Amino acid sequence: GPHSLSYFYTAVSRPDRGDSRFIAVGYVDDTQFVRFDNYAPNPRMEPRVPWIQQEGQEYWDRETRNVKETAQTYGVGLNTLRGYYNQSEAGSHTLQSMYGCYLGPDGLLLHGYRQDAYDGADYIALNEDLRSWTAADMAAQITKRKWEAADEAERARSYLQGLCVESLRRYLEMGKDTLQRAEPPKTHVTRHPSSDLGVTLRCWALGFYPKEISLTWQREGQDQSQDMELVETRPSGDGTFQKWAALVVPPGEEQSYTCHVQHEGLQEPLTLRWD
């Protein structure tokens, strides 16, 4: 699919510590490349993959200054929404934002987004046209009126159509070996006798990137799709992903079942079979 650059902000009020904690994570596609955490030593934007480490100190300085000011805004924001909702000062609350841009075939913005949630429920979002906002409730209508008077949607649109895709294109270049060269899955099938009339076959896909993948089981042509248990794709720990898909088959037959693997790192769909 199209490449993307996205940031994820979580602000949490911490009345037990007298402040609020602000964390930001940045992603290119499925790769976390930066983080900020103001409970960490010397809060700052920090690298989390090798290829962003080639940015010079002014890049880090600007990202740190900018996110520190955002954390400030979100600390007051938690204060303000607590008032909108008539909530007490003793409890902890959550303000989240996600925003990002997808890259079109011309190097321009394909589509982008900016959305907020308060205590895990949608609060306000920039609409698809990047010129208007949708407020979830009467509280977010207050925020909406402030952002409209400040012409915040134009600021969003400009960022998404400009800095966001331009930064994306630069990151895609610096991290080409991982962001633009897919790593195919390493695949194997295991067999577990599970009952007198059933054997469990598990098809593994390990160490792949990007995270999108298709694993399916098929006996001589038709796709098995009532109950083949498939785990949620999960991180490997090294920036790659893993997944498996399992189904129960009669002991007469394991050889007759085929696991099919679709991933961008494979020139052609892969088939795997018995155990």
């Binding site: 940031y7 902000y9 930001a24 940045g26 934007m45 890049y59 600007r62 990202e63 900018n66 996110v67 000011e69 955002t70 400030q72 805004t73 979100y74 007051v76 924001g77 303000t80 929404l81 303000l95 934002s97 925003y99 925020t143 402030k146 952002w147 400040a150 915040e152 600021r155 969003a156 960022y159 800095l163 966001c164 930064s167």
Partner: peptide, 9 residues
Amino acid sequence: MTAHITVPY
């Protein structure tokens, strides 16, 4: 790079 996100709630 991050957006300028400082307009009050």
